[PDB]
Design a protein around this ligand. Structure first.
Ligand SMILES: *C(=O)[C@H]([C@@H](C)O)[C@H]1CC(SCCNC=N)=C(C(=O)O)N1
Length: 242
């Protein structure tokens, strides 16, 4: 069952933006969103693709473990945190595109395409350059499709090893306190219109898990913090987090 709650639109309208939040109550097997149409519209995954990409790289041995160091190639890029060595944890934390571009090149088109089909991931379409198709190629995924994929990951039901899934879930760790744990991944798609921000993941509670996937129009990088801020406002409203 799916329930549309247009009152959440206020959280976007209050910030002069437009977007969708999708929530899934795992215990009750019920979904909620402010906009059923946009919840099923497919966008470039951008850096949210680092979840499947990490899973594939680990399962194929491209990445040995979460400690393996991926040395900076010495080319200065405009994101300072990218101009440094990384492991899987920090590369995910700082959305380090060039590290993941190298993963994708080593994975190769054929294994990447097969694995995305095995994951049932979005439109499963890698057309474009193997090292950038999630930024400007043919792959597309909706917020509801993000939740389906994340639910499989949470339950270790993706067609990769349990180890690979545990490591990626560790790398997704974003926030943790005495009340909840958030494992999630941000995304920012700019190369094809409309420019959007993503935040996808889930909130672990003592007795339930709430999956979430949001995207929102992002004409400038100034609004990027709204991805988390809007999502948390919905979570607060629904009494999922304090
Ligand atoms: C992921 O979606 C992007 C993309 C560049 O891979 C990274 C970058 C950022 S913020 C910097 C945006 N400008 C890049 N030239 C994020 C993010 O989600 O904050 N992810």
């Amino acid at each position: 069952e799916w329930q549309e709650n247009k009152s959440w639109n206020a959280h976007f309208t209050e910030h002069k933006s437009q977007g969708v939040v999708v929530l899934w109550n795992e215990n009750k097997q019920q979904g909620f969103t402010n906009n059923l149409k946009r919840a099923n519209q497919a966008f470039l995954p951008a850096s949210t693709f680092k979840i499947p990409n990490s899973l594939i790289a680990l399962d194929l041995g491209v990445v040995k473990d979460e400690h393996q160091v991926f040395k900076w190639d010495g080319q200065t890029r405009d994101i300072a945190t990218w101009n440094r060595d990384h492991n899987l944890i920090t590369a995910m934390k700082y959305s380090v595109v060039p590290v993941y571009q190298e993963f994708a090149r080593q994975i190769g088109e054929a294994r990447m395409s097969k694995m995305l089909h095995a994951f049932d991931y979005g439109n499963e379409d890698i057309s474009g350059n193997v090292d950038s198709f999630w930024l400007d190629g043919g792959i597309r995924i909706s917020a509801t499709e993000q939740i389906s994929f994340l639910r499989k990951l949470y339950h270790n039901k993706l067609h990769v090893s349990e180890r690979s899934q545990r490591i990626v879930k560790q790398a997704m760790l974003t926030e943790a306190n005495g009340d909840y744990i958030i494992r999630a991944k941000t995304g920012y798609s700019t190369r094809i219109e409309p420019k959007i921000g993503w935040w996808v993941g889930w909130v672990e509670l003592d007795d339930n898990v709430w999956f979430f996937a949001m995207n929102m129009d992002m004409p400038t990088s100034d609004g990027l913090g709204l991805r988390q801020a809007i999502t948390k406002e919905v979570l607060k409203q629904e009494k999922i987090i304090p």
